Amino acid sequence: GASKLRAVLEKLKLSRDDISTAAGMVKGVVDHLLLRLKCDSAFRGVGLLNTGSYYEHVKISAPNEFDVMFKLEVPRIQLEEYSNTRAYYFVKFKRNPKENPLSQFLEGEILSASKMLSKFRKIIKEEINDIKDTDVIMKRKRGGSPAVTLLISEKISVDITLALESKSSWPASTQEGLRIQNWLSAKVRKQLRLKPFYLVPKHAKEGNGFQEETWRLSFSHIEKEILNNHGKSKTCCENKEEKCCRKDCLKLMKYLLEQLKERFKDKKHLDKFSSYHVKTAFFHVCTQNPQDSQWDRKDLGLCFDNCVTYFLQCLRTEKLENYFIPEFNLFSSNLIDKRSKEFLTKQIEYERNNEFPVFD
Numbered sequence: 001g002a003s004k005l006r007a008v009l010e011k012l013k014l015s016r017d018d019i020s021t022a023a024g025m026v027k028g029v030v031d032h033l034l035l036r037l038k039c040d041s042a043f044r045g046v047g048l049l050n051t052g053s054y055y056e057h058v059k060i061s062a063p064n065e066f067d068v069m070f071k072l073e074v075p076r077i078q079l080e081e082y083s084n085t086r087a088y089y090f091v092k093f094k095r096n097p098k099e100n101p102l103s104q105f106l107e108g109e110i111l112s113a114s115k116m117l118s119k120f121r122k123i124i125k126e127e128i129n130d131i132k133d134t135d136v137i138m139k140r141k142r143g144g145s146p147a148v149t150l151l152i153s154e155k156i157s158v159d160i161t162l163a164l165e166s167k168s169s170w171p172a173s174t175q176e177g178l179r180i181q182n183w184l185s186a187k188v189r190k191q192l193r194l195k196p197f198y199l200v201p202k203h204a205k206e207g208n209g210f211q212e213e214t215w216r217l218s219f220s221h222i223e224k225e226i227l228n229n230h231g232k233s234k235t236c237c238e239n240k241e242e243k244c245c246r247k248d249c250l251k252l253m254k255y256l257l258e259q260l261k262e263r264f265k266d267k268k269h270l271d272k273f274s275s276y277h278v279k280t281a282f283f284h285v286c287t288q289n290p291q292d293s294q295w296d297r298k299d300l301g302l303c304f305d306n307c308v309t310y311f312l313q314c315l316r317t318e319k320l321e322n323y324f325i326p327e328f329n330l331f332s333s334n335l336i337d338k339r340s341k342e343f344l345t346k347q348i349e350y351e352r353n354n355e356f357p358v359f360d
């Protein structure tokens, strides 16, 4: 029902005002933090990376929650892949001169994530304590990559993550990734792959213990660009004759998962699932249907059923390739146990069989 779904989306559009006001409230604090952060010799080249659901224009239903990324430029780095993970790497440095301002964090030849995260939280703390014009508090440490967590005006929660920026060529694991050749063209793929890639501090788990000095690949900027320039036609969604329902589908998937996570928040089954899974699956569906005509607005129902159908498959086969790192499985049994996937499958299938009552 392309009408009921659009009723849901119209209902969703009402939150944009509050999400934008809160976004402004966040930006005000963030800019200050960055200006002050640029003072340290180590975090000199720190900058703001404007990516995420908000800048992708798909952020919904969470005004008091935000995620921001601080990017830092590392000139020349030698990357060492950790145990065929294809996504996690050790950061070494190409040259010998102590031009490196991060020499202080170098634990051996390998760059330590723990040390730099410590200095990051320390400086951020020292600076949030200084300003009293804005009621900003620093929350306790729980997460890994989203290392810093702030509370603005005792209302807004901001997840601050650190990211290294490398202008070098993308790692070999991304070779067969970003299959947009038949969709956004090969010229565009080449242009995009000429852009830098990022690394967020994350630990991998091979078993009982952890490796705490690893960095995981990040391409959020590429995701942003792909999302905000999503058509085979350059004038896609710029006129009435060329209006597609891609972003609508993504929004609907996100809302579906959100509602389902809210319905069973007390049972912890769906805790491991996030919106990135939905986004990834969506990108795969975009690759499957490269034509704008396959995303016509009038077919909003069908297209949505195409996305769900794919996502479900990913849940059943326990396979969801990272759109940039094909050999990395987001839905591997190591990451998410079968019981959770089967539960999510059960619920989604129920919803689809009862005309999505969760949409009302």
Ligand SMILES: O=C(O)Cn1c(-c2cscn2)nc2ccccc21
Pocket: 087, 200, 216, 217, 218, 219, 220, 274, 276, 277, 322, 325, 328, 330
């Ligand atoms: O860090 C990011 O940019 C997002 N991301 C997630 C993820 C899982 S739940 C939210 N995000 N899993 C990944 C695995 C490999 C590379 C990137 C991955």
Ligand SMILES: [Zn+2]
Pocket: 230, 231, 236, 237, 242, 243, 244, 245, 246
């Ligand atoms: Zn479009």
